[PDB]
């Protein structure tokens, strides 16, 4: 029943090279060529160099497809120096290679249902490593992300799949290009004046022989036929939360529980205790368990807070339960008695 298969092509870089490149200058096309997506599917099935040649191209090539450009990635040129010989000699081969940076494509191939089912099954199970046209460009989103469906035409299939926002506040293209294989309509019907030639129909793949094809572009407008999706995640990391409060009900029960086994007694000077102090803030706010809390008196909790404020104590506060942190606590508590007015 589903006659359309969908491919999601997104990565950090991608390069679907055009016809005018097998010299040292090796440029790219603005959209994925038919040979590129056909090769991606051939790797997903996982047949050999000549096994594609032996009656596999026209079964995937008569599938009149479309490619939908979500966002336009910019053309980045990489300065590639091949070492040539590093039989060998000190000569360096010079090259510049074009890549599409930050672009997302959706490719909808329309064909008979069983081929689409086999293509989706092989897309979920790539027997070989698949990439974005060049081996150094692995995909950043799953190629089998969007499920297949049944659609009468290429336009309905390419307008059904939504456009996914990577983050919450990013500029989206109001106008969205779509490039499809030219539907001949009725028998005859010579190609219109806007039909451009494109040498990307594979008939042999070692060495690559490409056949011309007619390629036509429509425009889609988002918000009426292409709809956005939800964010479905978080972008920033934002490490965990400090600043436990002092008025929530879950605080007072733990605070009163810690005042029991300590018998309302301080821990450094053994005075009658009236408050509690925290040792670490790994758990805070309301989530507190009574093994990292120290029952402290009024005159020494203030000294502890006087000492931990700017010592860079981060999370693990002053423990009154080790000898290392204690000997200066008494020296501190010497002078809170000395200068505070007792008189809220």
């Amino acid at each position: 029943p589903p006659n359309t298969l969908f491919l999601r092509l997104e990565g950090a870089l991608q390069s679907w090279g055009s016809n005018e490149a097998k010299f040292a200058l090796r440029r790219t096309a603005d959209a994925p060529t038919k040979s590129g997506v056909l090769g991606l599917l051939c790797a997903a099935m996982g047949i050999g160099r000549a096994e594609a040649a032996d009656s596999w191209l026209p079964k995937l090539a008569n599938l009149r497809m479309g490619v939908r450009i979500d966002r336009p990635g910019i053309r980045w040129w990489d300065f590639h120096t091949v070492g040539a010989g590093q039989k060998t000699r000190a000569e360096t081969l010079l090259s510049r290679r074009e890549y599409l940076a930050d672009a997302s494509f959706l490719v909808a191939l329309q064909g008979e249902p069983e081929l689409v089912a086999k293509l989706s099954a092989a897309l979920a199970k790539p027997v070989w490593a698949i990439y974005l046209g060049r081996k150094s460009c692995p995909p950043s989103r799953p190629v089998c992300e969007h499920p297949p469906g049944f659609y009468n035409t290429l336009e309905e299939a390419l307008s059904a799949v939504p456009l996914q926002k990577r983050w919450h506040n990013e500029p989206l293209p109001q106008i969205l290009p779509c490039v499809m294989d030219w539907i001949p309509g009725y028998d005859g019907e010579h190609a219109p004046d806007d039909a451009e030639i494109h040498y990307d129909l594979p008939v042999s793949f070692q060495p690559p022989r490409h056949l011309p094809r007619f390629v036509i572009r429509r425009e889609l407008v988002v918000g009426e036929d292409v709809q956005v999706s939800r964010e479905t995640g978080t972008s920033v990391w934002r490490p965990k939360g400090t600043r436990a409060d002092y008025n929530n009900s879950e605080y007072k029960k733990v605070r009163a529980e810690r005042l029991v086994m300590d018998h309302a007694a301080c821990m450094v000077c053994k005075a009658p205790a009236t408050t509690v102090q925290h040792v670490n803030y790994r758990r805070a706010g309301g989530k507190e368990i009574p093994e990292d809390l120290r029952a402290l008196c009024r005159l020494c909790h203030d000294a502890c807070t006087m000492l931990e404020y700017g010592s860079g104590m981060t999370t693990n506060r002053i423990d009154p339960c080790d000898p290392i942190w204690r000997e200066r606590i008494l020296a501190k508590r010497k002078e809170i008695v000395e200068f505070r007015s007792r008189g809220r």
């Binding site: 203030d302 404020y309 700017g310 000395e338 809220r344």
Partner: protein, 165 residues
């Protein structure tokens, strides 16, 4: 934002002797003097308990010391890169203006525990030009939000648009 406006109001309601003990505490921490820590506790602990959006300890201490030192009234729409930046139009553009601009430029590269001295010289430049009002609330919520780049970005181009008028 709640917790900050009442902090500014309680700082403005402080009397002269309390501001004096805050003035003497300027330049150091609050672990070496008792009444500074008692005052910070009195002005922080109940407002920390009452509101979840209380400012962070060290930025609140910095703003308390700076308000004790300089004592400018709270007024909306009078943040630092507007007032300084309108001050930066009346100076000699080739020598003096780059020097005051570098004085304001230094502020973007400190952490929170040495920040009070370049702020002090900037507010001294403000005091030398008879500036009575400062967005204390605005200064403290952009200072407590110092961990991000967009906040320093809007700080900076606010200075730019104050300069280009």
């Amino acid at each position: 934002n709640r917790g900050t406006v009442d902090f500014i109001a309680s700082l403005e309601n402080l009397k002269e002797g309390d501001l004096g003990i805050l003035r003497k505490l300027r330049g150091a921490r609050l672990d070496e003097k008792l009444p500074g820590f008692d005052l910070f506790s009195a002005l922080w602990w109940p407002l920390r308990q009452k509101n979840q959006r209380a400012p962070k300890r060290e930025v609140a201490w910095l703003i308390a010391k700076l308000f004790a030192e300089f004592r400018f009234e709270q007024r909306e729409g009078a943040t630092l890169p507007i007032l300084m930046g309108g001050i930066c139009r009346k100076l000699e553009p080739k020598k003096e203006l780059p020097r005051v601009l570098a004085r304001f430029d230094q502020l973007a590269s400190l952490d929170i525990m040495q920040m009070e001295e370049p702020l002090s010289v900037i507010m001294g430049i403000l005091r030398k030009h008879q500036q009575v009002c400062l967005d204390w609330v605005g200064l403290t919520d952009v200072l407590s939000f110092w961990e991000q780049e967009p906040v320093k970005r809007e700080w900076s181009d606010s200075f730019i648009k104050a300069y280009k008028i």
